[PDB]
């Protein structure tokens, strides 16, 4: 949605490593990256800040597959998956690589129980 790329980025994982040379942090274990409605899931996430220059951070997610979600202004979520997510914050786009897939959802529903017909239904009509 509008404003998503102005939000703080939260990255949660089971384990985190700090490269003692600075500017690289690695997350492993059910990593979730959130920025507004943006959500990336991955097994490992590498955050780099080249030269300590904030605003030029790069977030790389790796998974089998990693997954991507965002809500759009028009109400339809966008969902994707790939072996790797590459998000340069300076560029405002995400690159999915490796068996990459992206889709847009136009309808959904939740319940404790949902029935769904797996055979198509035929026109019901009759004359006198």
């Amino acid at each position: 949605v509008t404003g998503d790329t102005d939000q703080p980025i939260h990255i949660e994982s089971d384990q985190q490593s700090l490269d003692m040379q600075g500017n690289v942090v690695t997350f492993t274990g059910n990593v979730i990256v959130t920025q507004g409605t943006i959500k990336i899931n991955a097994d490992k996430v590498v955050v780099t800040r080249p030269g300590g220059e904030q605003g030029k951070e790069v977030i790389d997610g790796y998974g089998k597959p990693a997954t991507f979600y965002q809500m759009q202004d028009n109400g339809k979520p966008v969902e994707g998956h790939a072996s790797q997510m590459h998000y340069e914050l300076a560029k405002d786009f995400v690159v999915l690589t490796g068996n990459a897939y992206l889709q847009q959802v136009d309808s959904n529903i939740k319940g404790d129980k949902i029935t769904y017909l797996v055979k198509e239904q035929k026109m019901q009509a009759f004359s006198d």
Binding site: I11, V47, G55, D92
Partner: peptide
């Protein structure tokens, strides 16, 4: 982004968070 945003690392085990 229009401006740099904070990046927060959170440990699921402890709930502890820090800016990176």
């Amino acid at each position: 982004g229009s401006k740099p945003v904070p990046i927060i690392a959170c440990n699921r085990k402890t709930g502890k968070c820090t800016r990176i």
